[PDB]
Structure formats: C-alpha cells, structure tokens
Amino acid sequence: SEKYFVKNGQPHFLISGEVHYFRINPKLWRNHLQLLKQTGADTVSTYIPWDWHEIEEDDFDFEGKTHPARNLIRFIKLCKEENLDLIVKPGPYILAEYENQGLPSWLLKKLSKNAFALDENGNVISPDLVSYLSDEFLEYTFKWYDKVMPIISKHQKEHYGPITMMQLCNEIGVFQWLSGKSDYNPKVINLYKEFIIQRYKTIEKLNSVYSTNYNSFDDLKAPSGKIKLRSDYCAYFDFHLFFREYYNKYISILKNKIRSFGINIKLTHNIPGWIYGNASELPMLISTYSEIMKNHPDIIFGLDHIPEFVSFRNAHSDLACNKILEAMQPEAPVWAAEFQAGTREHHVKAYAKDLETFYIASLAHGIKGFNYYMFSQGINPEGKGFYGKTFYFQTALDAASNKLALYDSIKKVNRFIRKEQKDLLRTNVNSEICVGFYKPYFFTELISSQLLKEKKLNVEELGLYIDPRFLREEILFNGLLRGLQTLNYNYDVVDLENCDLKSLTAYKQLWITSAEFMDAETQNLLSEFVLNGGNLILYPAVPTLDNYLNRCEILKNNFGIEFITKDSSHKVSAFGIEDVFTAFSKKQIYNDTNSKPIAFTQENEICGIRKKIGKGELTILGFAFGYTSDEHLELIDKLVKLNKIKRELFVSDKDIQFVVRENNKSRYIFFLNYHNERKTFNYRKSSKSEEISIAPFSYKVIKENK
Amino acid sequence: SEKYFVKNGQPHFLISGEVHYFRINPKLWRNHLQLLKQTGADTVSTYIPWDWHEIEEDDFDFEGKTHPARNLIRFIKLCKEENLDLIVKPGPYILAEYENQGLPSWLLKKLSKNAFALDENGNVISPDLVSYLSDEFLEYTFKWYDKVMPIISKHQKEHYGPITMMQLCNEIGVFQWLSGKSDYNPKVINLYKEFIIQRYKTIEKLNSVYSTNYNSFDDLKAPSGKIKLRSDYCAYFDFHLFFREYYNKYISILKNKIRSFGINIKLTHNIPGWIYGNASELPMLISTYSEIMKNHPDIIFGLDHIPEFVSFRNAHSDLACNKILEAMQPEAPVWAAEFQAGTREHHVKAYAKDLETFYIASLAHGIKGFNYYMFSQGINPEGKGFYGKTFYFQTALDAASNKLALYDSIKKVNRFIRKEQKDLLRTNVNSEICVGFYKPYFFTELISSQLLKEKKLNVEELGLYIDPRFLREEILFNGLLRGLQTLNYNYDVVDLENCDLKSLTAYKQLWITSAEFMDAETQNLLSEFVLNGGNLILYPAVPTLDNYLNRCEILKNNFGIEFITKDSSHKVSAFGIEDVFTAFSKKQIYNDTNSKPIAFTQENEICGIRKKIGKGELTILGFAFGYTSDEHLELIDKLVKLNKIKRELFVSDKDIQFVVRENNKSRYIFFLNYHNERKTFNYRKSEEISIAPFSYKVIKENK
Numbered sequence A: 001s002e003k004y005f006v007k008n009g010q011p012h013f014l015i016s017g018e019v020h021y022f023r024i025n026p027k028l029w030r031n032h033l034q035l036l037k038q039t040g041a042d043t044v045s046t047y048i049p050w051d052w053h054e055i056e057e058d059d060f061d062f063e064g065k066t067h068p069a070r071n072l073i074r075f076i077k078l079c080k081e082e083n084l085d086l087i088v089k090p091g092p093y094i095l096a097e098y099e100n101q102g103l104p105s106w107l108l109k110k111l112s113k114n115a116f117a118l119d120e121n122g123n124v125i126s127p128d129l130v131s132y133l134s135d136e137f138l139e140y141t142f143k144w145y146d147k148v149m150p151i152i153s154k155h156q157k158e159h160y161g162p163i164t165m166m167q168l169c170n171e172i173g174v175f176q177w178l179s180g181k182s183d184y185n186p187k188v189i190n191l192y193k194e195f196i197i198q199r200y201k202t203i204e205k206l207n208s209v210y211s212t213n214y215n216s217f218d219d220l221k222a223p224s225g226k227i228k229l230r231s232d233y234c235a236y237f238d239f240h241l242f243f244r245e246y247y248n249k250y251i252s253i254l255k256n257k258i259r260s261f262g263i264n265i266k267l268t269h270n271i272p273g274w275i276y277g278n279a280s281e282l283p284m285l286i287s288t289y290s291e292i293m294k295n296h297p298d299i300i301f302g303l304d305h306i307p308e309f310v311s312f313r314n315a316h317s318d319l320a321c322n323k324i325l326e327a328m329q330p331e332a333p334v335w336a337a338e339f340q341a342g343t344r345e346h347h348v349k350a351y352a353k354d355l356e357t358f359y360i361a362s363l364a365h366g367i368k369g370f371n372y373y374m375f376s377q378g379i380n381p382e383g384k385g386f387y388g389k390t391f392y393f394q395t396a397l398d399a400a401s402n403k404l405a406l407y408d409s410i411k412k413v414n415r416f417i418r419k420e421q422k423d424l425l426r427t428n429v430n431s432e433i434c435v436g437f438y439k440p441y442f443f444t445e446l447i448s449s450q451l452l453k454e455k456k457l458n459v460e461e462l463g464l465y466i467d468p469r470f471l472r473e474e475i476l477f478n479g480l481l482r483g484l485q486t487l488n489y490n491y492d493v494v495d496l497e498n499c500d501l502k503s504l505t506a507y508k509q510l511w512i513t514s515a516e517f518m519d520a521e522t523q524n525l526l527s528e529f530v531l532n533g534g535n536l537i538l539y540p541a542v543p544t545l546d547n548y549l550n551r552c553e554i555l556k557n558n559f560g561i562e563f564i565t566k567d568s569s570h571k572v573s574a575f576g577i578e579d580v581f582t583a584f585s586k587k588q589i590y591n592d593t594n595s596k597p598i599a600f601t602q603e604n605e606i607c608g609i610r611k612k613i614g615k616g617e618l619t620i621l622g623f624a625f626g627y628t629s630d631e632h633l634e635l636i637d638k639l640v641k642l643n644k645i646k647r648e649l650f651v652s653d654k655d656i657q658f659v660v661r662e663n664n665k666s667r668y669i670f671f672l673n674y675h676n677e678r679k680t681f682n683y684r685k686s687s688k689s690e691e692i693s694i695a696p697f698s699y700k701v702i703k704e705n706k
Numbered sequence B: 001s002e003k004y005f006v007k008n009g010q011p012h013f014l015i016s017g018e019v020h021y022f023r024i025n026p027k028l029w030r031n032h033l034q035l036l037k038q039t040g041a042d043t044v045s046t047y048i049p050w051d052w053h054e055i056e057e058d059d060f061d062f063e064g065k066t067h068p069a070r071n072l073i074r075f076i077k078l079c080k081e082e083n084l085d086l087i088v089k090p091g092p093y094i095l096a097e098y099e100n101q102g103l104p105s106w107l108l109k110k111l112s113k114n115a116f117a118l119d120e121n122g123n124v125i126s127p128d129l130v131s132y133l134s135d136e137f138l139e140y141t142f143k144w145y146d147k148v149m150p151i152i153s154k155h156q157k158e159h160y161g162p163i164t165m166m167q168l169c170n171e172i173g174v175f176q177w178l179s180g181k182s183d184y185n186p187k188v189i190n191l192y193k194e195f196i197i198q199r200y201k202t203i204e205k206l207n208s209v210y211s212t213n214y215n216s217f218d219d220l221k222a223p224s225g226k227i228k229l230r231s232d233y234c235a236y237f238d239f240h241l242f243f244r245e246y247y248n249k250y251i252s253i254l255k256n257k258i259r260s261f262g263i264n265i266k267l268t269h270n271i272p273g274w275i276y277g278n279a280s281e282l283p284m285l286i287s288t289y290s291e292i293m294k295n296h297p298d299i300i301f302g303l304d305h306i307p308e309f310v311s312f313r314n315a316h317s318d319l320a321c322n323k324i325l326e327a328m329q330p331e332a333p334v335w336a337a338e339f340q341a342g343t344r345e346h347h348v349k350a351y352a353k354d355l356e357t358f359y360i361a362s363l364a365h366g367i368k369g370f371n372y373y374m375f376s377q378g379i380n381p382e383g384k385g386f387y388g389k390t391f392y393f394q395t396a397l398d399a400a401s402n403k404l405a406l407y408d409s410i411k412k413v414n415r416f417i418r419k420e421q422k423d424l425l426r427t428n429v430n431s432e433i434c435v436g437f438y439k440p441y442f443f444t445e446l447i448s449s450q451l452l453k454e455k456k457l458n459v460e461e462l463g464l465y466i467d468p469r470f471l472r473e474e475i476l477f478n479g480l481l482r483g484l485q486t487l488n489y490n491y492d493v494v495d496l497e498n499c500d501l502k503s504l505t506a507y508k509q510l511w512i513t514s515a516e517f518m519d520a521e522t523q524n525l526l527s528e529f530v531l532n533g534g535n536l537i538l539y540p541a542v543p544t545l546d547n548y549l550n551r552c553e554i555l556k557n558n559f560g561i562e563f564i565t566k567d568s569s570h571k572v573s574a575f576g577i578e579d580v581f582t583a584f585s586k587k588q589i590y591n592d593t594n595s596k597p598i599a600f601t602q603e604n605e606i607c608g609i610r611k612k613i614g615k616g617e618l619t620i621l622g623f624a625f626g627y628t629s630d631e632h633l634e635l636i637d638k639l640v641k642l643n644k645i646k647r648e649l650f651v652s653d654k655d656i657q658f659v660v661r662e663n664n665k666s667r668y669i670f671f672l673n674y675h676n677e678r679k680t681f682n683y684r685k686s687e688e689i690s691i692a693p694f695s696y697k698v699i700k701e702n703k
C-alpha cells in the first residue's frame, strides 16, 4: 500500500524536466524536448508567464505574433509531437527569477495602493507583492485566466493534447515569508475580523479564552507588534489560523475559476522552504497549507528541493521534508515539483557529482516522482531576468541545447528508475518508530521564523521556557529526525490532528517532542494510545496548557505524573550516559511513584522516568536534547533499544547511511556516503559479510531477488 | 619585504599543535608530545585554566598534588624533554568550552553584584560574565597572575626556557559580540563618561557634533535601545569607540602586570568571528581591537580560523581575513592562533581531506604560521566541560593519543612546509589592486551584526539607504573580495586610518566601497590620491556626510561631482554589460560635464562616470553590486582591465583558483580546486594537470 503515480494501471515513476520555452530560442525547442525525452523523462514542465503573454493591458500573444518565443501554442504542439506530457504553471505568480515574479509591469504600475501587501503602518511591503484577495488583483488575474485557460483546456490529455497537470500560482506565501513581514492590507484585516466573529460568536466568549476585557468585537484589532501578554499570544494564534483559511480561500477561488473552463487535469501546488541548502523552516511553510490540504483532496502538493550541496551538513533535510509531506498528504505520492538541477545563482555551485547522489538519496528517502528544475538553462529575452540575463547554470542542457555534465548523471539515474520502477515504486521501509507532527508548534510564521525581521515571540515573557520554534527546529528537525537518520533507524511521521488511534498501533514506539502546551484532543489521543498498549517516548515536557496557554492537565493526570520545574546545570545523566548536555537550566523533576528513575540532574534529582500505564509503556524525559554531541546519539540509540528495535543491517562504519526498501518480490539496499572520505566497510543483514568501497559524497545501490 | 617567524636566524614556519594537558591522561602526556613532534611540529600550545589550578581561594596546585593532571610543572618538563617550544594561555578567560569559561567556581560564587557585566536595568547578564575592569575581578586576576606568572617567567625563552609566547586572556569582547549586549556596569559607564569628556572637552562641543541639548555632561546617559535619531547614531558610534579604548585599557593592565614578573617573550591575542563555516563577520571583530593594535606593537594578534568545510561556498573567507589582518597588523606575520583541526561539534564534521586542502590554501593565502586547534582531543575532567565529556572530534590524536585520519594529512602538509619554508615565507603575491578598509563601517557589534537577533541600526529612519553592514558584508566581503579571488586577481587591503599616501601610490588601482558617510581625513586622503596620479574606483556612493552624519562633501567637491538620488529598476547597464543587478532602487545620477558616462538606469539616466582629476583617474558607480551573477564577475573584470591589470597566469579552466607567490629566485603556483569535480586544465604565463575534487597542486618554478 505505497502511494505512487499510475499509467495504464501500472506503477509509473513521474520523471519531468523543466524547460522554459519563453527563455529558449524557438528554433531549438524541439532539440530540448528530444534530448529531455532521450533521458527517459516522460513529462516536461514550464511556467506560462502572464507578463510574457499579456504584453500590454488587453493585448495577448500566445502565437509568437510579437516575439517568436511567445508561441506557447507551438511549444504545446511540439511536446505532443515529441511524446512528452506537459505540466503548465500559468501563475499568476511564477517566481522563476522573472521580472516582477511574473506579474506584468503594466499591471503593477496600474494597481492602486490597496492591491498591495501592507505593513502594520499601511506602507507597501514590496512593489512586486500583491494582497492575494485584493479585488483588483483577482480581477486582472481572472482576465489573464480568461485568455490562457481556454488554451490549456483545449490541449488537455482528455482532448488528446499533452497537458496532464497544472500548478495553481506558485509557493503561496513564499514572497511574504522572505519579505520578513506579514500582510495587514484592509481586506486581510476585514476578513480576519469576520473570522474572529464566526469563531467566538460573542465578545464574552473571546474574552473568556484570551483573558481580555473588550466591550465589543469593534474594539479588537488584528494583532501587531511584540507578544508581551498571553492574550497577545492567543490573538496571534488565531491570526495564524486565519492565514491558513486565507490561503485556502485564495487557492479555492483560483481552482473554481479554472474548473469553469472545462479543465479536469490534476491540479498541483509547490512547497517552498529550502534556503542556503537546509530545509529546517520548510515544515513551518507546509503548515501554512493545513486548511488547503484538508479541503482539497484533488490538489497534489509537491516539494521544491534545493539542497545546493550533498553532505552530512544537510543529509537529513530531504528525508524529514518527504516524511512531513507524507504526514500532511498521506493519500498522494511524495514528489518534488522542483527537483534541483543546476543552480539558480552563479555564485552557488551545483556539482553533477553532488546532485546525482541527491537523486539516489531521494529514491532511498521514498520520492515517487520529480521534475528536474532546471533541466534546460534559459536566456531571458527583452531584459525579463530578475537578477541577470542567464537563467540557471550547470543544468542538463545549456540554453543552446548542448549536453552539460549533469545530462549523463540524469540519464544514469533515469535508466535505473525505468529498469526498477515496477518493484521500486511498490517498496516500503520497515518503520518501527513513529514521530508525532504537532502542527500548532509550526504556526509561528507571523511571530517567530529564521526569516521574520521582528522577533515577536519571547516565551519567557509568558512564564514559559520551551520556545515552539526552538523545539521544532533543534529538538525535532535537526535533533531527533537527524539522529534517527544518522543511526539508520527508519521512522514515519504522523499528523496528530484528527489522528486515528489505529494508525499509531502498528509502531513499536511513538515519539512526541512536546512544549508546555498541547490541545485537549492531542493530550487525550496520546493518553488513549498508552492505556491501550502503545509505547510513548515524550520530552522535553509533560504539557500543562492548551494552545491558548489556558490550563490543560489531561495527559499529566491520565499518566499519574507529578512534577516541579527546577533550575540545574545543563548536563544530566540518562540511562547511565554521563554529561548529556540539555538545552535548558529549567527541567521537570518527577517523583519516583510507580516508576523507574532513568535520568538525574547534577544534584541527583529525577528528571526522567519509565512506567507501565494500562497495557502501554511511558518514558518521560524532563529535559531537551537535539543532536549537538555524541551523547545525544548514544541517548537516542538507548531509547530506541528500550523496545528491542534493530537496524536492518550491521555496517562496520557507523558514518555510512543506508536504507533497505523491500516488497514481496525485491529488496533494494541504498548506501549513502555523506562525508569527504573514501570509505571501505563491510555489512550484513541483521539476520559472509559483503565488502564495499564508496567514494566521497557518493552512493551504492544493491538489488536482491526475494 | 615579508613578515615571518624566525628560528636559528632563518625563516621559520611556526607549526604548533594545541594539546590540553588538563584534559589528557597524564600517563599519555609524553606520548601526545612525541606524536606531535613526529609530525614535524615545533611548538605545543595550551591554556592554563585558573579554575583548574586555584582549586580553592588561595590554594594553588601546579604540581599534581590534588589531581595528576594539575601537574603543569611536569607538562613543561615534558615539552623540554621532547624538544617542543610552548605557547601558554593563562587567561583569566580561556573559554575553550571549559565550565565558567575558565574562571574558578569559588570566585564567581563570592564576587559582589558590581563585579558582573550588567544590562541597562542593572541585572547580571550571565553568572559566567564579569566586567573586565571590575576592581574585585582584577584583584583576583592579579592574585592568579602572582602564582602562575613566576612559573611562566622561570620557563620563558628570554631565560632560555621552552615558553616562546603567551596569550593574554581569550577573544576580548567575544561575549559582547555573541550576546549583542554591552556591559552597563556603572564602572564601565563612568569610564565611558570620562572618554566622552576627554574627547569633546565641553558639553557645547558634544552638542554641536550630536545635535543634543544637554546643559552639562551630567545630563549624558549611555546609549541603549534602537537608533531612532541621528543623535542616537552619534552616541552609539562613540560608545563603539569607547569599547575599543576599554579593551585596550584591560589588555594594558594585564600586559603591565605580566611585564612586572620580567616576562619579555612575545605576547599574543586571538581573533574570533567564524560561525557556520564563513568569516564575513570576522572583520567586525578585528575592528574591536583597533586601539590595542595601535598602542601595542609587541602584542601579535592571530586568527581563529574555523572553516568547517572547504568549497567555493567559503573559499574567500580565509584570504579576506588574512588580508584584513595584514592591513591592521603590517609589522607582524599573519598567523592562525587557532587553526581548525577536528571539530568542536560532533554533528559538524571536519574531514581530513577538506582540512588538508584548507592548510595548503592557507599557505597560498599568505599564512606564516599556525596552531592546530585541536591537535589532540581532550576528555573534560570531573564535570568541568560546559558541553559533554569529550572536547573535540576528528582531531589528529584522540584523547588517548590514538592516531586518527587527520594525523597523516598534518604530517604530509608539515613535510611540504619544512621542505619549502626558507623560500615560501619570503614570497609575496604581486598586488596591483588595493582595497580600502574603512574601520568605522565595521564599528556596529552593539547595533548591527549576524549574531545580533534584532537590529538597533535601521539607516532609513536616519534618511540614509546604504547600511554599513550590508555594504561591508555583501558589496565588499562576499562581493568584491570574493569576485577578485574567483577571477584570480591579486589584491592587498590597506587600513585607511592614518594611511600614508606613499603606501597607496605603488598600486595601479584603489577600490573604495563607500557608504553615504566618510570622515574628512579619509575624504582628504582619497582626494590627494587621485589628484597626485592615483586611479580610484568608488561605489556605490560618493559620501556627503562624516562619521557623525554631519555634512562633509570634501571628496564630492574636490572631484567636481554633482548628483541627485533617484529611484529606478534594480538592473543597470555598465560598460556595455546589460542587466547588472544592483542592491538599491535609489542610485546616484551624475552630472556628466567634463565626464564620460559609463553606466545607465533602465530609463538611460547616468549612474556611473569616468573622469580625469589632476594627474589621476576616477571611476564612480552610483549603484551597489556584489557577486550574485556572472554579470558581476564581468563588471569587476572590466573595471580591473581599465588600468590594464593582468592575471599572473592563463588557466584553461576558469573555475580553478590559483595564487602565484614569488621572490627574486623562487615562484610557487598554488592551484586550488574548490569544486566537487575532477578538473583537467593547462596553464601558461599571461603544462596539463588534473586535480581531484576539493584538492590542490603546488608547482615550483626557479626564476
């Protein structure tokens, strides 16, 4: 029961390459398509830029009347002739390093100030950055759809055209995220006031939750400036809930408009979050799509992977992101809408030898399809390049359609996929560990992020000490998930929201990284999990508040935990590992009632315990560790071993990463060497040992029959 | 010509390894020192931790009475017996991931409130962090010196002992940097007031500079919070100057105390600033030692180089840092007091094959000595590690003196260095390009840094648009310097403060990355440079203000420049290069009378001019570009070619970096491959070689 794309009721690996017709000499379009097809790619992908085709207000060219490379119709016809399916992405935003992110110059000059995203002061955040639900913006977006959408509709697969998929806009919220500011446009404010009225019904109900003293809803303003009171936190938390409804309204409006043209193809969206070759903030961005993914089973989200290099420094980002996408979208294949090929920036090199390993590591890490971005380099015509004339470097093909070094790497990877896809797409890893994804810890893009200008969340001011962003980046993303991957223990991630208990009972262990706050439903779910026979590992805190920081002690009471928070040395001992460095002086100190103490402070106070509760097991650690020392890996390994979980292989070099994927028929062993060392090692199945030599930053794949 | 260490009257490449006796099994001390010597290393370096030897107040153990690893006397004997010189570093601060950063637990327990660094509300910043000039802190510091300095004096090189250098404290100011927090201890603020009174003499003089409305110096409060007004910018600027004098005062008290024991060896200090494997902030940290470097020509500053990996992503960091240290310390060798060996962080790998390439690149980039940090791993004794049990990973030796992969890399690099040091140390690059270092742009560690979470400096609130940190990081460090190195053009850096005109006239071009403000002295210096025959390249602004943001247009008026600041598309054309991405909407649009327009906005407005002024040449670009496109390399290459500057070689692969080092007799060509690609290329003077990924090749030529 893997999820994978299907062609004529067979497992099909979606292999696309991105080829920007608008940035290639049209005399060479066919050569680019033939060379893509010759790699074993089945699909080609492109933006259709609004700025490129609405050359002036109400002057459209899709036929190359005014510039040969405006002949979208001819590009579509060539894709059909060269037996490639086509993904089209008509925006309105395309990003794509295109002037004004794809929006017409004439549009941005004409729009009045209230079409734009505005800061708390009423000023324009950026001259390219519109307010998504601006009446003016959506009027012009609709007139752009009125011209491009009939073309897309006529050329759909169901009309024997090549068009199989369409992206709606591009990375909703990404422009906002990188700007470092949130949108306070008066459309946003007014929609937020309606959301608050709908949510609370009476000002008394809102006052009771927030601990505010408003006389009426007319006194409540959209939250701005720093969080100083728990009532400011509550307002911001609802502001985050609102923005998820807001992005759902945007994509809904676009989708309803598109469907009205007879467009029945698969609709997509693309997830931003990588920056400087890490993706620790991506889970924050995917979390902004929570309401889209609940309301639209028919929009498939795909990842925009930009690793830039392939090493232990970022080995864990693609797997964690693939796992988190699966957690939020479990009924669709994990795929990369944008799968790095070459480099968007001259000064940031993309080596074929890095990317080839990333491609193989992505297959190890469960990817089921991808679109090489950029397969073909572009040259911007007519000064449309945001940052210079050349679009991408170190691609598979240069703009002229010459093969570059990466072409042979992609041909190699694609050849393996086409030979193995029928088995490989149907393989799973044996995950005996589940890691809880608690989305509200990620709902901070308005107040706390790697990219927000203003740090608005200081939890110490609220009488708290566990910052949710610190927890989800350093304890979970760069900590637990990194540690498990480094130790070669398979894990799955499961979204705790509306989570079915039956979807947790298959695991030997459930791991919850918890702050001091957690909603009643999740506290009850984890309670029922243990009582019914589940094995829970919970740290660094038993929560005692709900998402509004009001009292909620359900899980503490159901587990018979008593604790006091006390200051000590950062270093604790745990399971007989000395000098385990922990993130906080404050730790939870548990009494040893009906429990085994397994962790101790420098004053020998109990900061961790194990107990049996109903049919289940609980391990609580009152301290925070990620992976910033060897003791942290020793501690994770010890915790996993509490339930006799074993690695799939014995490998003589602990720095070698492996993944075993198998079904009934076949076993694939992926070895990954994320280190600048030629490694010679031996291995065997945990049930004579084979010797292997692996180059720096390289891979081996072994296939076994049975 | 060149500055280098000397041994037996000959050029000597200082090869030191860091070995923390206090973190090593004393039964294996001799074994560590023998394995270090066997790599060809000549020196061993260590902290002498105050907490480790003053075990209780006025109870000193330097002879292993209470713990065998407290036997400093025996470690010194072993260095002598195994023929290694010794660098000692007795603090008071040692940092070194040692609990309390090396200060005794008993001291920190007992010190009054007024001995600690205080926030602007009078609260202790950190139970770890004393005020450097606390009378109570210096009293106890001095009682520690009274016991450890006689031991160092005994064994110092001027008494023919093994101790050749001593470090004073450790990374002075590093805590103000990483925290963003200034010390507001009333003792520090009293010193700040004295500094201001001494500087301005009367409140009237200060009011005329700051545009303040004080009736006396009694109305004057230390700056704090966000800069909202130009008067706040002025106060914070002098607060930065004050902290450079404050650090000078601290190091001077330590130095005078040390000299009183008759310790006459070379004193040192160490420069922090690398994080996450780049060093774009280190020039800010070096700027904090400006007053020390001016007043103490007998204190050698060395660099703390922490590259973490070796690729095109960080290739430019170590050269830029080495060049800026040479600019501020021209009479002493450029050396790394802490030269990455292994990793402080288990999860941040240090590959022997990366570090080997970094060591050879350091030689190409002009390093004259270094101290492998950490040569030997350590095990923290009885809880005294701030982090876990282990100190460093992937070192040359583990804590039990096991050889690890890096050992063989250090032995190979050391053998090369010993074979070549007599000629290599006496080689320089031929730099025809000089890049100006304007230190006031770097004086922002209290208000604007990569480490400072929230920014106190927002120049738009002051009617400016060129932020000095954005300029010195993106336009200068990751822009011009990265670009010249990528293009294989030699540059030197020169400190513009008190700068000799004579020392600019050797160069065919001087490059100035200018904000809207620049002091009268530097404006006068650059005026005289061009008028006397110099070729100046200046962008992205003709300055119009001084360091206090008061009108100063000396350079503008001397050069006959007129401009209006106007908004346009980020892209300009320059020297016929289309689509040059520039940082700002706002650009300087120049009157072109007596001038050649060479750059244009999307609307064809003149945003760059060339001009003859007296006997020299001026190139002004009213726009900011770094290195974020191939057009940026094209533009730097075009600008360098205006004065017919040539690379020292033609190399067939543009992605191969090279450094040609020569003297009259000897040439070394260092080829560096910072890319994950096997490269085959050929070279000739302005012959076909293969280099592995992240690797190197050195070629010698007799002249």
Ligand SMILES: O=[N+]([O-])c1ccc(O[C@H]2O[C@H](CO)[C@@H](O)[C@H](O)[C@H]2O)cc1
Residues within 6 Å of the ligand: A095, A171, A174, A175, A178, A271, A272, A273, A274, A275, A276, A304, A306
């Ligand atoms: O300039 N801009 O407004 C702008 C620039 C870049 C941008 O996104 C791009 O860079 C992000 C950071 O690396 C990626 O996470 C994202 O996937 C990618 O598409 C969006 C807007």
Ligand SMILES: O=[N+]([O-])c1ccc(O[C@H]2O[C@H](CO)[C@@H](O)[C@H](O)[C@H]2O)cc1
Residues within 6 Å of the ligand: B095, B171, B174, B175, B178, B271, B272, B273, B274, B275, B276, B304, B306
């Ligand atoms: O926690 N602390 O108080 C603390 C931590 C680290 C520290 O300095 C160390 O790390 C810096 C940042 O990477 C380096 O630039 C510097 O060279 C090195 O010595 C100083 C104090």
Ligand SMILES: [Ca+2]
Residues within 6 Å of the ligand: B559, B560, B561, B562, B591, B593
């Ligand atoms: Ca003039």
